[PDB]
């Protein structure tokens, strides 16, 4: 499977000028473009090396769509402020996520078009790409408006056409790097914590893609009720990092096994301290 995503944030700053608009685009776990309204000449720019050979036409159309959306968000933030009967001086946020997923055949599994206002769900297009989910009463007003105006068909036409068509093209531009995996380099570390117990940390380093499963097991049984897990973190080179830890009795280290699942690993790893 492959994915195309755009993460769009519009934050009004009353008294500090016009709202701040950022849209950042991803294919899978690799950022490929960004637009930031506060940049030099604000425009869509390549954020991956395989994007830099695109012509002036591609960038001008992308830049024009970002500027259209920027005005759409300033209007939408003002409209939402009236919907919620909010006062004039607060900063508020609209967020929009959109993109598409493709399978082994590289045809659309699902398209996304969903919004958050002030960090919470606002309205989302359903998997049918025909109906909307309003999170609250202000979003029911929005749902009535877009259903009458046939907004769903407008996004659906993009999701079924341009989004998949260009996501497949991006897979060609970055084929040598986007389709690669880096299997995790995994190790277990040991740190004493008491005179009674020890922390065993299972490490995974230098892996792409970001998706991974780490589990600790005792005598073949998941210890996820005792696991401390951090979020998968980016190394900064395109790879990711993660660890899972269990706290176990002194002298019991060799009874615990950590298991590693990753798209680069045909078989899951079993490691011991």
């Amino acid at each position: 499977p492959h994915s195309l995503r755009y993460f769009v944030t519009a934050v009004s700053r009353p008294g500090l000028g016009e709202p701040r608009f950022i849209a950042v685009g991803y294919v899978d776990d690799t950022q490929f473009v960004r637009f930031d309204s506060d940049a030099d000449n604000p425009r869509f720019e390549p954020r991956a090396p395989w994007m830099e050979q695109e012509g002036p036409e591609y960038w001008e159309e992308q830049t024009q769509r970002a500027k259209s959306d920027e005005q759409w968000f300033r209007v939408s933030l003002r409209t939402a402020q009236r919907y919620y009967n909010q006062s004039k001086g607060g900063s508020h946020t609209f967020q929009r996520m959109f993109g598409c997923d493709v399978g082994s055949d590289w045809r659309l599994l699902r398209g996304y078009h969903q919004f958050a206002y002030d960090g919470r769900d606002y309205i989302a297009l359903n998997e049918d790409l025909k109906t909307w989910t309003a999170a609250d009463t202000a979003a029911l007003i929005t749902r009535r408006k877009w259903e009458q105006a046939g907004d769903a068909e407008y996004y659906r036409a993009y999701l079924e056409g341009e989004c998949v068509e260009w996501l497949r093209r991006y897979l060609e531009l970055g084929n040598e790097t986007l389709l690669r995996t880096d299997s995790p380099k995994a190790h277990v570390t040991y740190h004493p914590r008491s005179q009674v117990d020890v922390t065993l940390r299972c490490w995974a380093l230098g892996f792409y893609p970001a998706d991974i499963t780490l589990t600790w097991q005792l005598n073949g049984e998941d210890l996820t009720q005792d696991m401390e897990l951090v979020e998968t973190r980016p190394a900064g080179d395109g790879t990711f990092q993660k660890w899972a830890a269990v706290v176990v009795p002194l002298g019991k280290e060799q009874n615990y096994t950590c298991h590693v699942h990753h798209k680069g690993l045909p078989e899951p790893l079993t490691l011991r301290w």
Partner: peptide, 9 residues
């Protein structure tokens, strides 16, 4: 390929 919004919220 980015797409711009149509109807306002």
């Amino acid at each position: 390929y980015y797409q711009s919004g149509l109807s306002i919220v």
